[PDB]
Design an enzyme around this catalytic site. Sequence first.
Site, PDB file in Angstrom:
ATOM      1  N   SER A 210     -82.520 -17.639  97.891  1.00  0.00           N
ATOM      2  CA  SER A 210     -82.245 -18.899  97.184  1.00  0.00           C
ATOM      3  C   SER A 210     -82.817 -20.043  98.019  1.00  0.00           C
ATOM      4  CB  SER A 210     -80.755 -18.986  96.887  1.00  0.00           C
ATOM      5  OG  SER A 210     -80.436 -20.203  96.236  1.00  0.00           O
ATOM      6  N   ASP A 274     -83.457 -14.663  86.217  1.00  0.00           N
ATOM      7  CA  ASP A 274     -83.031 -15.671  87.177  1.00  0.00           C
ATOM      8  C   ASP A 274     -83.864 -16.935  87.007  1.00  0.00           C
ATOM      9  OD1 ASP A 274     -81.888 -17.038  89.243  1.00  0.00           O
ATOM     10  OD2 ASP A 274     -82.742 -15.803  90.844  1.00  0.00           O
ATOM     11  N   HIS A 311     -78.694 -14.247  89.937  1.00  0.00           N
ATOM     12  CA  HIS A 311     -79.267 -14.920  91.094  1.00  0.00           C
ATOM     13  C   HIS A 311     -78.759 -14.403  92.432  1.00  0.00           C
ATOM     14  CE1 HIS A 311     -81.011 -18.040  93.559  1.00  0.00           C
ATOM     15  NE2 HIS A 311     -79.823 -18.463  93.949  1.00  0.00           N
TER      16      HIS A 311
END
Lengths: 386, 384
Positions: A210, A274, A311
Amino acid sequence: MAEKWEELSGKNNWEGLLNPLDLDLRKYIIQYGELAQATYDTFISERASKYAGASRYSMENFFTKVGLDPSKYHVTKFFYGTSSIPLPDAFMTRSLSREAWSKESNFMGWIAVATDEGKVALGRRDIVINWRGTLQVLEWVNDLQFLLVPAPKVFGHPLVHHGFHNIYTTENPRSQFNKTCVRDQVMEEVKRLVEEYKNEEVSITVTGHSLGASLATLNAVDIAFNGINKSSNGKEFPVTAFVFASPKVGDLNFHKAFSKLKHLHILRIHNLLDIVPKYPPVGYFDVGQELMIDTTKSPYVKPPGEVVSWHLLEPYLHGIAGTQGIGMTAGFKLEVNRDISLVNKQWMILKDEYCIPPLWWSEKHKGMVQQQDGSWLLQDRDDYEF
Amino acid sequence: MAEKWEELSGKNNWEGLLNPLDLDLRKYIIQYGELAQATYDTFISERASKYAGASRYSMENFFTKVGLDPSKYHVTKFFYGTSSIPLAFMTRSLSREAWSKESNFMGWIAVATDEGKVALGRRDIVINWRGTLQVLEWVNDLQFLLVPAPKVFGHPLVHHGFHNIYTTENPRSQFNKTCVRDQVMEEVKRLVEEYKNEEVSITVTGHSLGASLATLNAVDIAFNGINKSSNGKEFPVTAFVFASPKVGDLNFHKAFSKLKHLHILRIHNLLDIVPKYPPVGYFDVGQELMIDTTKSPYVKPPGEVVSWHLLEPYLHGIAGTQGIGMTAGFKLEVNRDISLVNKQWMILKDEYCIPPLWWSEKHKGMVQQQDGSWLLQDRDDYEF
């Protein structure tokens, strides 16, 4: 696997190893994802903690308490970062306590180096740098601005995400743990480890997920562009990054500068549904090689899912563990014996039938321990010095 | 406090002790509240658990692992109940090796330790009924048919769903071949027989649904002489119930008024909607103490129907209540830790730095195995 470590670390940019996915690379990607997930498992996000934003585990107890192999790497340093521009109030965790350990800095990740036993299993003296992202998606991916700014600390043409760069390079002389920016705290440790093991065969591996994947990517380019992988005796050590659910970092010149670095290779893991890899929406370019997965094809996860479930990192690693491609008739079957319970550590994802509690990665009583008084105090961090 | 135990247990119906709230009775109500709270702290509500609906702690580890004093009482029996009518009330496991498909742990019985006797002033037998942490899933949809209770009385009408849980027996079941009533009564009798030569008191506790079951169970004890020993004694029965819905009709209340060896103290929180249930045809029994947890400067205002109902807010309310008058205020008269109200919910203000819903096992029961995998092993090793 140790003998093939150079190829697994992207010597040939993983050509022929992704479709179909090589079995040893499948294990390779997962084990570095475990080192990235370890940043999440140690990070105190509970704002009630007077150590909110810090690592609850010391360097010595680290791999044991995050549920990994303590015989393979040894943690050498925690690094911390701060910021100076308006950011989404979920990038930096702030304690509600008046005894707060820090009001400016957060634990951004940790650096470890292979042990002697680990060097045999890995095939070389591997130095791993693991950047911490966040669990939150909806709180930043749709509101964070993406101005393009230069990075003088990195390149001295390339433009870079303003928010990621500020976290990366902000100093504060009045701060307790960020007198130097998080970038330099990393580079100084990489330099001393490169100097320490200069007489051996050494690799540098960066992991991130991320926001940590964007900072890991910028950090990897930074290391290779400035010769921080070069030792005082003339050796060039390879730099490799395995990043997961990565938003884009820079513009065309950033990609152009990445292409010239011949001792650097990035492998990005991208889950189909995602939405974070879409960010930023315009003016940014990905760098490195990309493996596509689709966790939706897994029969273990609760349909239909949401953006958070698509995610998080443990679903990514579960998706890599069983991916057969993203085509319409690819399917899904676990090729490694990776415990499916890991997927519920920070979210509810598994189907009810698998009998795994949701958000189960939690300390006993969430850090509350009873006193002789009979009352309870929040003591949620190991005894170590910062 | 030990010399006044009869007064604190309602010998004079707590007259002169409720407003202003006497300090010894304040601690007294909180102490019995803690025993009721242990029913929630040991109960496995996680449906992923093979042992969902059962106690996660053994009777040997009980008081130490629920955070209370283990040298005062000693657990002597877990009792279980089942149902036969449609009713959330009974926790069902999702495991294919579920410990039970029919029963839930309904509470526990303990007896005063030798040293607990000196502290309590007598050999007190405590029966603690488990309630629920949920409110809106039943308080506005659970039917309230008035039915007779032949096992209890042989005129009084009582709540259909409460009585069904209380009296349902099931041959084929592992743990409810006898109803939950007879499981409690048998242990109560043998404890009365075992301590028939000492000063004995019987105290029933309960919160929410547990309070209604505790009310019905206390009336059942005194009515059928289960407090009577073989050597002629009649030991007093006292019920401390919290956030209690009503149990029976006027004849149930009329049968309660005739039992002079029984006293019930109900703790009622002003905004709590549960004590209004059922809405018509039911009657409270016993003495009542009113509190208002929203007068506390510690809890995050203004709260909701769950915050106003849970047991630990009730005990924090009792610890600091000054009355419900407009200018009454709030101030802790005992040093009860405010963090306890965040055990099953988010209630405290952020400034107090207590995590929400913090009562939880390490990794929620997950335990790593030698090969690096994780299994859900969330229950002490003990025989049911």
